[PDB]
Amino acid sequence: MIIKPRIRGFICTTTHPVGCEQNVKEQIALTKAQGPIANAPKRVLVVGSSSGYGLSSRITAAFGGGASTIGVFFEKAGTEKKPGTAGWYNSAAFDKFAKEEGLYSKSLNGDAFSNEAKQKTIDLIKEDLGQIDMVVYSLASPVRKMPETGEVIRSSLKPIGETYTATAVDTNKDAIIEASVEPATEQEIKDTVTVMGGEDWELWINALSEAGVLADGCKTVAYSYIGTELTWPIYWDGALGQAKMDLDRAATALNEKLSATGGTANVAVLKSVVTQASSAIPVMPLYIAMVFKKMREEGVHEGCQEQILRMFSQRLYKADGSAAEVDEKNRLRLDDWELREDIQQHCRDLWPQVTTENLKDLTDYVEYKEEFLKLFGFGVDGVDYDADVNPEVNFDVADI
Structure with a gap:
């Protein structure tokens, strides 16, 4: 479809999928330009990883420190007829680029306050990373x-x-x-x-x-x-x-x-x-x-x-x-x-x-x-806002 901004005040009911991916790209490029963090942790969990400080936390750790990352969030995927939340495309764009670099990237989508959130995280850590050396708590x-x-x-x-x-x-x-x-x-x-x-x-x-x-x-x-x-x-x-x-x-x-x-x-x-x-x-x-x-x-x-x-x-x-x-x-x-x-x-x-x-x-x-407006993916630079866009965008994420 073609994605407008529906914004009055500071409620914006619309997100732009590519603008969001472009925002993760800029933040990734910024971190890489600072160079590797020699002493950075290697197996990082981010509870609340899809926007703001939580997303930048996941980006620093992975693209500045070379860490494997698991992130937890509660976002809404996009369907063919309705774009999802900025945090969904933010995360999806993270996964894309981390996988393009050979960095471990898994994501769990649901209620981070629920007991089940802790269990699915404990389980997922046990399938590969085994243990975690940093927990970023960035729920908002x-x-x-x-x-x-x-x-x-x-x-x-x-x-x-x-x-x-x-x-x-x-x-x-x-x-x-x-x-x-x-x-x-x-x-x-x-x-x-x-x-x-x-x-x-x-x-x-x-x-x-x-x-x-x-x-x-x-x-x-x-x-x-x-x-x-x-x-x-x-x-x-x-x-x-x-x-x-x-x-x-x-x-x-x-x-x-x-x-x-x-x-x-x-x-x-x-x-x-x-x-x-x-x-x-x-x-x-x-x-x-x-x-x-x-x-x-x-x-x-x-x-x-x-x-x-x-x-x-x-x-x-x-x-x-x-x-x-x-x-x-x-x-x-x-x-x-x-x-x-x-x-x-x-x-x-x-x-x-x-x-x-x-x-x-x-x-x-x-x-x-x-x-x-940039939060929801609008006004960004590398984006033609007249292009058709598919709001369905998947990545390595499991519910609950």
């Missing part, structure tokens, strides 16, 4: 079906205590507005820790030890975010702040466990990036447009690929083998460039002066929307 679901009870829990992006009011950009008018978010209830906060904390991370690690498929010295990392003071009432003091609290607790527990045979567990705090959910909080497109413009000017701008490459080659698996620099809570900090003072101070100074009228001058907002 706002929803968790509890593995014992079937109850469906969703997280909430709300402050705690008081209302959160901030400047924001209105959708599809590009008009500066004031957005408000109500405080979380006592149950919405629990539920956020349940979905976005470290419980399911610990379930993956603990179940994988109890099958023997965790290699001695295995390291595991989960991804988090601290953000600017513009979003402290959600990401630090809000419902999601209690979740990240819980991820710290899990990392401490997991780090003690794997420490037995020399391994580690860390939370990695990553930078602001444009993702399919990033436009949830209303201030985030406004802030991201502004700080991306400054960070481009200072030459410190990065995407998801560069972030995970730097985590690999400048934190976890450094050429000289020296230990990763961590913060006081034993977290890796890859948001160190974005949270530099001259960068943050620039946003602080410009923030009161942003208007509908100077939006495109003070911020890279028109670029923001292009990058957001």
Whole structure:
């Protein structure tokens, strides 16, 4: 068929299969250009491997470190009459290129929170790789079906205590507005820790030890975010702040466990990036447009690929083998460039002066929307969008 973009606001109900493959191609080319990571792990599991940091995690490990990779995700294949989700083609394109290079690549598609997800992974590891030496926990679901009870829990992006009011950009008018978010209830906060904390991370690690498929010295990392003071009432003091609290607790527990045979567990705090959910909080497109413009000017701008490459080659698996620099809570900090003072101070100074009228001058907002469209495979360069495209695209993936 011929694939349009059906997009109003920041909901895009359409994906472009080749644009997505072209996006994996660019990220792969970027990692290869940095050269092999001498000390990188060889048998890598990525729980949540189909987009954003998870996809770049799988790409770094395979195409920068030469690793065999198993990835877990929940995507929707495309039929002849309906394109699938970006994550489906992202994964399919990964498999294509990894297999073209002789790298092991298997993928499991389903509910990564379910007990069955851990079993099919334990089994699949046992058929070839035998053991895993790194687990990337990069799930980004706002929803968790509890593995014992079937109850469906969703997280909430709300402050705690008081209302959160901030400047924001209105959708599809590009008009500066004031957005408000109500405080979380006592149950919405629990539920956020349940979905976005470290419980399911610990379930993956603990179940994988109890099958023997965790290699001695295995390291595991989960991804988090601290953000600017513009979003402290959600990401630090809000419902999601209690979740990240819980991820710290899990990392401490997991780090003690794997420490037995020399391994580690860390939370990695990553930078602001444009993702399919990033436009949830209303201030985030406004802030991201502004700080991306400054960070481009200072030459410190990065995407998801560069972030995970730097985590690999400048934190976890450094050429000289020296230990990763961590913060006081034993977290890796890859948001160190974005949270530099001259960068943050620039946003602080410009923030009161942003208007509908100077939006495109003070911020890279028109670029923001292009990058957001790039998530679903549109606006990409090596693609003729008038070409017919088959949305049915298969690869080495098994359900459940």
